[PDB]
Design a protein around this ligand. Structure first.
Ligand SMILES: [Mg+2]
Ligand SMILES: [Mg+2]
Ligand SMILES: [Mg+2]
Ligand SMILES: [Mg+2]
Ligand SMILES: [Mg+2]
Ligand SMILES: [Mg+2]
Ligand SMILES: [Mg+2]
Ligand SMILES: [Mg+2]
Ligand SMILES: [Mg+2]
Ligand SMILES: [Mg+2]
Ligand SMILES: [Mg+2]
Ligand SMILES: [Mg+2]
Ligand SMILES: [Mg+2]
Ligand SMILES: [Mg+2]
Ligand SMILES: [Mg+2]
Ligand SMILES: [Mg+2]
Lengths: 129, 80, 205, 82, 150, 123
RNA sequence: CCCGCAGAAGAAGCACCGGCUAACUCCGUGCCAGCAGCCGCGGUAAUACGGAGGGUGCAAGCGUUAAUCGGAAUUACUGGGCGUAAAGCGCACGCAGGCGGUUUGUUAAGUCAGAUGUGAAAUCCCCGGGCUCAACCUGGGAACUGCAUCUGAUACUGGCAAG
RNA sequence: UAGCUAGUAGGUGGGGUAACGGCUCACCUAGGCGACGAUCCCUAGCUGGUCUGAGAGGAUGACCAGCCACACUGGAACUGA
């Protein structure tokens, strides 16, 4: 938004699915995709397209199961002026491991799993679930 | 070598000495939030070739004066 | 102490036989199973959601003859030792030299046994022991003192040791009056319908 | 005047001393540099019961560790050469 | 195995022309050891005549939960009206740890060992369903890979 | 609130007022008994209860109640303040421990004798 | 500490039972006497005052007081609210301060990783020994969020350069 | 309590301490500290730790151990590592 970008992103999706929306959109950004991969490649979205070599556009194709949405439990965390950082023995574990928390480790951003799997900490992001 | 610090020579109205307020960060021991701080020291500059609005690294050493225990090591930035 | 008073009057405030006084008849008359535990036997003591854990208390408690404090120390630790804190408690209440010695035919009533141990008349794993609240670990070489193997108590007692649902978690041969705690009394084998889903709550407040 | 002396740390009647390298003018068992082994005065033959960390002893005597009597006796009392 | 236990029985009244009247209220829930729960609520001019209505309405119109071995699994937390409740999975041994309603509504809902606590008001007729609301979201560890994976 | 909104002035505890001034950590203090009287209750109650204005050792003269039936409490008779307030008695935030110093315990009280003052009936 | 010696012998009390709260009856009293942590008890049939009968709970102790934390998410980072319940300055401008669209390069300070000194011992805790047990005593390890230093990582944050 | 401070902040040379230094003296510059809260007022020995608590947090610093300070009150130096 007119301050913190990513914040809006996580919202856009949670909002859309809230009203069985097709697929919300937002101006794509390198960090936006790094968090996008951990969605399509982590089972949470169909896929994301692009548009604009100079004026990009992210496209998170939401999903829904039986009679409810898929990604129905997302929230930001390491927001500005409150950024959170934790060590390996502090790493998160979204909803008792049942969920996932995007973590921007020194070795690229990746799901909570790859965090311990790779053995290292990173800028915790959201609590996808 | 120590570690030094690219502090700010806020003061220079002294001789062979200059008050410098070093910027610092730290997480709140409760609410947890990176906050800026300051470290005003009485550096020493025999030749007094620093200047205000500038930027220099300071190093601790023998107690030169009552409060002045640091000396100038280099002037990274300067001008105004 | 340990109540040291009327056992039946106390068993009424519970109903289900809490062992204690036995080796003869008891129950069905000669006790008044919930007929008049005090004076208002008729007036139904409709307990509350709290009354349970509390009324339950006296059972898993008085049945073994213990105080209120000594019990807590047990439970509190009954949580420390890894594993289901629930049953992890009954175990200690079992290894107690009280029920142990008693459950091997020695003495008719646990209290009758508490006297034996207290009077040096009891021996275990070689060296003598006269302290009831002694955590009797398994494999020990328990046996009555040969300095009184033939007295009377243990005699007219070891007899009903047969009727007592032969314990599996251990092996006791009335022969020379010796026995060894095989292994922990896994809840199940502990012939009791007692509900412990309270003992863990009433003390978890 | 650093040295390896003894410091009582056992319950009443049943004392459990603790040899440690400390200063001469030091209290009973307070200020101390480093605890080198101990000594339990009981019995019943429990394999061991009175270590000492021989190797640590020498580590200090090199300077001026005024190892007192009893403690010095420990070195001997225990297999110093075994 | 339909377990049924009372939750609360207040009096409740109302004033009128001639004078005033009363309609005792009965709160009750239902469920089976498996993991089903179905609360209710009724009232009448008598403690019993009302207690029955409550249960009946309870035994009917119910929902099931993905109850695990005996406790729960993920951080359950259901809210309703003026009351916030939180339920945590208590490992085997630690019996059901709850206060008022949130207690009775569990020793019959299947859950044997669990430690939970509220935050908002203590109003029973509100805290009860507040617990169910949590179960309502209590999904199982499996099936997730189905909704997301491929 | 806002994190920074706190960094300026972090939350603070509301210093609870000790409803027992003539306390000073002391669970009880001796007395002097400035005078003893018989006042009336609040509003919903009646009957003239017994109260007394005893002067503490720290000069914190205050008033106390005299539980139990009857009392030998005279005037210069010293007593040991207990504490604990009352309802019908306004201000009275202390009670006189019976069976101690000068004040004698209740008479013929064969129940809850710990209070007041009665050392065993007659065995 | 062990043996022997008479002989149940020398060794039970305290609080509570109107609701929270386990535990009820009968008398005496009659807004008097008195009870009372809160709501409140008593103005002739008190489970609430006093005694007894009984019961309930504790135990060589029980109860009252005093004092801290808990409950109290009731100062709320975890973990709170502000339309009407307490709560948006009457409104603007704006310094400091806090926050910062997007891409690349660089830096590596925040941060993450590993190494090292160091964070006394003793409490604590895990396992395990010594007192007949326990209290207590004791071995080893874990732990000691920490501080700094060395070398690496570069996703995000910050700095610089170019937009 | 919103201002505070002349041996005050720094610089030269003498002097001094076991040793750095306004530590002290002479002279010189006119600094130094402060809302990231100085100065002032009330209170308190500090820590490991202790109590409570799910944890974070709150309360506390008796006995054991490390550190500091004090020795009728105010002041001072002598001996001596
Ligand atoms: Mg309805
Ligand atoms: Mg409330
Ligand atoms: Mg009080
Ligand atoms: Mg009741
Ligand atoms: Mg009374
Ligand atoms: Mg009457
Ligand atoms: Mg709190
Ligand atoms: Mg509020
Ligand atoms: Mg208002
Ligand atoms: Mg306005
Ligand atoms: Mg330590
Ligand atoms: Mg950058
Ligand atoms: Mg000089
Ligand atoms: Mg003082
Ligand atoms: Mg709490
Ligand atoms: Mg003096």
């Amino acid at each position: 938004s007119m301050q913190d970008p990513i914040a809006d992103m996580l919202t856009r999706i949670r909002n859309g699915q809230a009203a069985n929306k097709a697929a919300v959109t937002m101006p794509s950004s390198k960090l936006k995709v790094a968090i996008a991969n951990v969605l399509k490649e982590e089972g949470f979205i169909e896929d994301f397209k692009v548009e604009g070599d100079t004026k990009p556009e992210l496209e998170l194709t939401l999903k829904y199961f039986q009679g409810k949405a898929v990604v129905e439990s997302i929230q930001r965390v390491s927001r500005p002026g409150l950024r959170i950082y934790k060590r390996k023995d502090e790493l998160p574990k979204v909803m008792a491991g049942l969920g996932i928390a995007v973590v921007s480790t020194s070795k690229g951003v990746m799901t909570d799993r790859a965090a311990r799997q790779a053995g290292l900490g990173g800028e915790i992001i959201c609590y996808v679930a | 070598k120590i570690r030094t610090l690219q502090g700010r020579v806020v003061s220079d109205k002294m001789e062979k000495s200059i008050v410098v307020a070093i910027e610092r960060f730290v997480k709140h021991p409760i609410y947890g939030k990176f906050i800026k701080r300051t470290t005003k020291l009485h550096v020493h500059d025999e030749n007094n070739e620093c200047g205000i609005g500038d930027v220099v690294e300071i190093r601790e050493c023998r107690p030169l004066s009552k409060t002045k225990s640091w000396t100038l090591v280099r002037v990274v930035e300067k001008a105004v | 102490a340990r109540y040291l008073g009327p056992k039946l009057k106390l068993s009424r405030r519970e109903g289900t036989d809490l062992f204690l006084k036995s080796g003869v008849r008891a129950i069905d008359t000669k006790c008044k199973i919930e007929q008049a535990p005090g004076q208002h036997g008729a007036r139904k003591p409709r307990l509350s959601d709290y009354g349970v854990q509390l009324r339950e208390k006296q059972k898993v408690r008085r049945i073994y003859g213990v105080l209120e404090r000594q019990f807590r120390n047990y439970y509190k630790e009954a949580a420390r030792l890894k594993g289901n804190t629930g049953e992890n408690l009954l175990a200690l209440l079992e290894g107690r030299l009280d029920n142990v010695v008693y459950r091997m035919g020695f003495g008719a009533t646990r209290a009758e046994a508490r006297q034996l141990v207290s009077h040096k008349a009891i021996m275990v794993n070689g060296r003598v022991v006269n302290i009831a609240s002694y955590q009797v670990s398994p494999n020990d070489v328990v046996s009555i003192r040969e300095k009184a193997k033939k007295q009377s108590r243990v005699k007219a007692a070891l007899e009903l040791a047969e009727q007592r649902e032969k314990p599996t978690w251990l092996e006791v041969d009335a022969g020379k009056m010796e026995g060894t705690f095989k292994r922990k009394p896994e809840r199940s084998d502990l012939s009791a319908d007692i509900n412990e889903h309270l003992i863990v709550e009433l003390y978890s407040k | 005047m650093v040295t390896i002396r003894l410091a009582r740390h056992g319950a009443k009647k049943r004392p459990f001393y603790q040899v440690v390298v400390a200063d001469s003018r030091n209290a009973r068992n307070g200020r101390f540099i480093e605890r080198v082994g101990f000594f339990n005065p009981i019995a019943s033959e429990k394999e061991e019961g009175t270590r000492l960390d021989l190797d640590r002893i020498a580590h200090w005597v090199g300077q001026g560790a005024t190892i007192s009597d009893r403690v010095a006796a420990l070195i001997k009392e225990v297999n110093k050469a075994a | 195995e339909l377990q049924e236990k009372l939750i609360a029985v207040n009096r409740v009244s109302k004033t009128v022309k001639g004078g005033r009247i009363f309609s005792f209220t009965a709160l009750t829930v239902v469920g089976d050891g498996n993991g089903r729960v179905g609360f209710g609520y009724g009232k009448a001019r008598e403690v019993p005549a009302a207690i029955q209505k409550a249960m009946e309405k309870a035994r009917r119109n119910m929902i099931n939960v993905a109850l695990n071995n005996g406790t729960l699994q993920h951080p359950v937390k259901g809210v309703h009206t003026g009351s916030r409740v939180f339920m945590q999975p208590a490992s085997e041994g630690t019996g059901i740890i709850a206060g008022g309603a949130m207690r009775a509504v569990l020793e019959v809902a299947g859950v044997h060992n669990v430690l939970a606590k509220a935050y908002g008001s203590t109003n029973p007729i509100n805290v009860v369903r507040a617990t169910i609301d949590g179960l309502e979201n209590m999904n199982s560890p499996e099936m997730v890979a189905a909704k997301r994976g491929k | 609130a806002t994190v920074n909104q706190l960094v300026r002035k972090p939350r603070a505890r509301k210093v609870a007022k000790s409803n027992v001034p003539a306390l000073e950590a002391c669970p009880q203090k001796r007395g002097v008994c400035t005078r003893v009287y018989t006042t009336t209750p609040k509003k919903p109650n009646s009957a003239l209860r017994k109260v007394c204005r005893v002067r503490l050792t720290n000069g914190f003269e205050v008033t106390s109640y005299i539980g139990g039936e009857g009392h030998n409490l005279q005037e210069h008779s010293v007593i040991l303040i207990r504490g604990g307030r009352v309802k019908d008695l306004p201000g009275v935030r202390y009670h006189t421990v019976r069976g101690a110093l000068d004040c004698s315990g209740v008479k013929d009280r064969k129940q809850a004798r710990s209070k007041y003052g009665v050392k065993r009936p007659k065995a």
